[PDB]
mmCIF file of all heavy atoms in Angstrom:
data_model
loop_
_atom_site.group_PDB
_atom_site.id
_atom_site.type_symbol
_atom_site.label_atom_id
_atom_site.label_comp_id
_atom_site.label_asym_id
_atom_site.label_seq_id
_atom_site.Cartn_x
_atom_site.Cartn_y
_atom_site.Cartn_z
ATOM 1 N N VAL A 25 -1.022 -16.597 -26.613
ATOM 2 C CA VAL A 25 -0.142 -15.484 -26.949
ATOM 3 C C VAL A 25 1.160 -16.040 -27.501
ATOM 4 O O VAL A 25 1.882 -16.751 -26.788
ATOM 5 C CB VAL A 25 0.110 -14.567 -25.743
ATOM 6 C CG1 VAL A 25 1.199 -13.569 -26.063
ATOM 7 C CG2 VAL A 25 -1.163 -13.817 -25.403
ATOM 8 N N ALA A 42 4.275 -9.308 -30.077
ATOM 9 C CA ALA A 42 3.439 -10.238 -29.342
ATOM 10 C C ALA A 42 2.061 -10.287 -29.990
ATOM 11 O O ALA A 42 1.431 -9.247 -30.199
ATOM 12 C CB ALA A 42 3.339 -9.823 -27.884
ATOM 13 N N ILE A 43 1.627 -11.480 -30.359
ATOM 14 C CA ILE A 43 0.289 -11.697 -30.886
ATOM 15 C C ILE A 43 -0.520 -12.448 -29.852
ATOM 16 O O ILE A 43 -0.009 -13.337 -29.169
ATOM 17 C CB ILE A 43 0.299 -12.492 -32.199
ATOM 18 C CG1 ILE A 43 1.205 -11.784 -33.208
ATOM 19 C CG2 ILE A 43 -1.118 -12.793 -32.668
ATOM 20 C CD1 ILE A 43 2.222 -12.705 -33.762
ATOM 21 N N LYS A 44 -1.793 -12.098 -29.741
ATOM 22 C CA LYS A 44 -2.740 -12.887 -28.968
ATOM 23 C C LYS A 44 -3.884 -13.310 -29.887
ATOM 24 O O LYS A 44 -4.800 -12.521 -30.156
ATOM 25 C CB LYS A 44 -3.277 -12.109 -27.764
ATOM 26 C CG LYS A 44 -3.885 -13.007 -26.731
ATOM 27 C CD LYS A 44 -4.905 -12.277 -25.925
ATOM 28 C CE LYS A 44 -4.827 -12.683 -24.475
ATOM 29 N NZ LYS A 44 -5.385 -11.597 -23.626
ATOM 30 N N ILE A 56 -15.997 -6.406 -31.261
ATOM 31 C CA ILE A 56 -14.556 -6.420 -30.982
ATOM 32 C C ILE A 56 -13.833 -5.196 -31.525
ATOM 33 O O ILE A 56 -13.308 -4.391 -30.757
ATOM 34 C CB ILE A 56 -13.857 -7.673 -31.547
ATOM 35 C CG1 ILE A 56 -14.434 -8.978 -30.989
ATOM 36 C CG2 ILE A 56 -12.359 -7.613 -31.266
ATOM 37 C CD1 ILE A 56 -13.583 -10.204 -31.396
ATOM 38 N N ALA A 60 -11.348 -2.766 -29.637
ATOM 39 C CA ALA A 60 -9.930 -2.630 -30.009
ATOM 40 C C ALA A 60 -9.552 -1.201 -30.379
ATOM 41 O O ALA A 60 -8.398 -0.809 -30.165
ATOM 42 C CB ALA A 60 -9.573 -3.569 -31.173
ATOM 43 N N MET A 63 -8.895 0.169 -26.802
ATOM 44 C CA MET A 63 -7.675 -0.400 -26.239
ATOM 45 C C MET A 63 -6.452 0.204 -26.903
ATOM 46 O O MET A 63 -5.487 0.586 -26.235
ATOM 47 C CB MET A 63 -7.659 -1.930 -26.403
ATOM 48 C CG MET A 63 -8.866 -2.631 -25.839
ATOM 49 S SD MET A 63 -9.348 -1.643 -24.446
ATOM 50 C CE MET A 63 -10.251 -2.861 -23.526
ATOM 51 N N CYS A 72 -0.503 -0.765 -21.116
ATOM 52 C CA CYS A 72 -0.173 -1.265 -22.447
ATOM 53 C C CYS A 72 -1.286 -1.023 -23.469
ATOM 54 O O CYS A 72 -2.480 -1.052 -23.155
ATOM 55 C CB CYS A 72 0.147 -2.759 -22.370
ATOM 56 S SG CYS A 72 1.776 -3.082 -21.633
ATOM 57 N N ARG A 73 -0.870 -0.793 -24.713
ATOM 58 C CA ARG A 73 -1.749 -0.381 -25.801
ATOM 59 C C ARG A 73 -1.845 -1.481 -26.854
ATOM 60 O O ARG A 73 -0.840 -2.096 -27.228
ATOM 61 C CB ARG A 73 -1.230 0.923 -26.411
ATOM 62 C CG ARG A 73 -2.002 1.508 -27.586
ATOM 63 C CD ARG A 73 -1.375 2.872 -28.003
ATOM 64 N NE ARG A 73 -0.559 2.806 -29.215
ATOM 65 C CZ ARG A 73 -1.064 2.649 -30.433
ATOM 66 N NH1 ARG A 73 -2.372 2.555 -30.630
ATOM 67 N NH2 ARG A 73 -0.237 2.586 -31.479
ATOM 68 N N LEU A 74 -3.059 -1.761 -27.300
ATOM 69 C CA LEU A 74 -3.218 -2.598 -28.477
ATOM 70 C C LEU A 74 -2.655 -1.843 -29.682
ATOM 71 O O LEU A 74 -2.967 -0.660 -29.873
ATOM 72 C CB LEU A 74 -4.693 -2.948 -28.673
ATOM 73 C CG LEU A 74 -4.980 -3.698 -29.964
ATOM 74 C CD1 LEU A 74 -4.301 -5.055 -29.961
ATOM 75 C CD2 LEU A 74 -6.466 -3.826 -30.172
ATOM 76 N N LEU A 85 -4.724 -10.133 -32.054
ATOM 77 C CA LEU A 85 -4.317 -8.843 -31.515
ATOM 78 C C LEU A 85 -2.798 -8.766 -31.408
ATOM 79 O O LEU A 85 -2.159 -9.706 -30.945
ATOM 80 C CB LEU A 85 -4.967 -8.629 -30.152
ATOM 81 C CG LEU A 85 -6.472 -8.786 -30.320
ATOM 82 C CD1 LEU A 85 -7.184 -8.867 -28.977
ATOM 83 C CD2 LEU A 85 -6.985 -7.632 -31.143
ATOM 84 N N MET A 87 0.619 -6.519 -30.141
ATOM 85 C CA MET A 87 1.124 -5.468 -29.260
ATOM 86 C C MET A 87 2.607 -5.691 -29.025
ATOM 87 O O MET A 87 3.196 -6.652 -29.516
ATOM 88 C CB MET A 87 0.350 -5.388 -27.938
ATOM 89 C CG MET A 87 0.419 -6.623 -27.023
ATOM 90 S SD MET A 87 -0.006 -6.507 -25.226
ATOM 91 C CE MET A 87 0.540 -4.903 -24.658
ATOM 92 N N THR A 151 -1.628 -4.721 -18.677
ATOM 93 C CA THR A 151 -2.148 -5.224 -19.934
ATOM 94 C C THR A 151 -3.482 -5.904 -19.690
ATOM 95 O O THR A 151 -3.802 -6.329 -18.577
ATOM 96 C CB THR A 151 -1.175 -6.207 -20.616
ATOM 97 O OG1 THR A 151 -1.635 -6.467 -21.946
ATOM 98 C CG2 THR A 151 -1.110 -7.528 -19.866
ATOM 99 N N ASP A 152 -4.261 -5.973 -20.763
ATOM 100 C CA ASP A 152 -5.443 -6.811 -20.822
ATOM 101 C C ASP A 152 -6.606 -6.165 -20.078
ATOM 102 O O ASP A 152 -7.320 -6.857 -19.333
ATOM 103 C CB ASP A 152 -5.114 -8.203 -20.259
ATOM 104 C CG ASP A 152 -4.927 -9.264 -21.347
ATOM 105 O OD1 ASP A 152 -4.681 -8.923 -22.529
ATOM 106 O OD2 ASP A 152 -5.022 -10.462 -20.984
ATOM 107 N N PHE A 153 -6.827 -4.865 -20.268
ATOM 108 C CA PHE A 153 -7.996 -4.222 -19.676
ATOM 109 C C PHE A 153 -9.200 -4.404 -20.600
ATOM 110 O O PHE A 153 -9.139 -5.149 -21.594
ATOM 111 C CB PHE A 153 -7.761 -2.744 -19.379
ATOM 112 C CG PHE A 153 -6.945 -2.019 -20.407
ATOM 113 C CD1 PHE A 153 -7.560 -1.207 -21.348
ATOM 114 C CD2 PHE A 153 -5.557 -2.130 -20.411
ATOM 115 C CE1 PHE A 153 -6.808 -0.534 -22.289
ATOM 116 C CE2 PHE A 153 -4.791 -1.460 -21.354
ATOM 117 C CZ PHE A 153 -5.417 -0.656 -22.296
HETATM 118 O O1 IXR B 302 -4.777 -8.327 -26.903
HETATM 119 C C1 IXR B 302 -4.666 -8.059 -25.748
HETATM 120 N N1 IXR B 302 -3.443 -8.413 -25.067
HETATM 121 C C2 IXR B 302 -2.377 -9.048 -25.801
HETATM 122 N N2 IXR B 302 -1.488 -9.946 -25.232
HETATM 123 C C3 IXR B 302 -0.505 -10.372 -26.240
HETATM 124 C C4 IXR B 302 -0.741 -9.736 -27.487
HETATM 125 S S1 IXR B 302 -2.010 -8.772 -27.376
HETATM 126 C C5 IXR B 302 -5.758 -7.328 -24.948
HETATM 127 C C6 IXR B 302 -5.233 -5.935 -24.606
HETATM 128 C C7 IXR B 302 -3.934 -5.571 -24.977
HETATM 129 C C8 IXR B 302 -3.438 -4.319 -24.661
HETATM 130 C C9 IXR B 302 -4.248 -3.426 -23.976
HETATM 131 C C10 IXR B 302 -5.541 -3.782 -23.613
HETATM 132 C C11 IXR B 302 -6.040 -5.040 -23.919
HETATM 133 N N3 IXR B 302 -7.021 -7.267 -25.689
HETATM 134 C C12 IXR B 302 -7.613 -6.204 -26.512
HETATM 135 O O2 IXR B 302 -7.188 -5.130 -26.748
HETATM 136 C C13 IXR B 302 -8.957 -6.710 -27.064
HETATM 137 C C14 IXR B 302 -9.906 -6.083 -27.890
HETATM 138 C C15 IXR B 302 -11.068 -6.766 -28.247
HETATM 139 C C16 IXR B 302 -11.285 -8.074 -27.779
HETATM 140 C C17 IXR B 302 -10.337 -8.689 -26.960
HETATM 141 C C18 IXR B 302 -9.163 -8.002 -26.595
HETATM 142 C C19 IXR B 302 -7.939 -8.385 -25.708
HETATM 143 O O3 IXR B 302 -7.733 -9.403 -25.119
#
Side-chain angles (χ1 to χ4, degrees):
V25 171
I43 305 127
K44 198 206 219 156
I56 301 189
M63 305 328 203
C72 286
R73 179 176 104 72
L74 174 64
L85 305 169
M87 63 161 325
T151 190
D152 257 19
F153 38 101

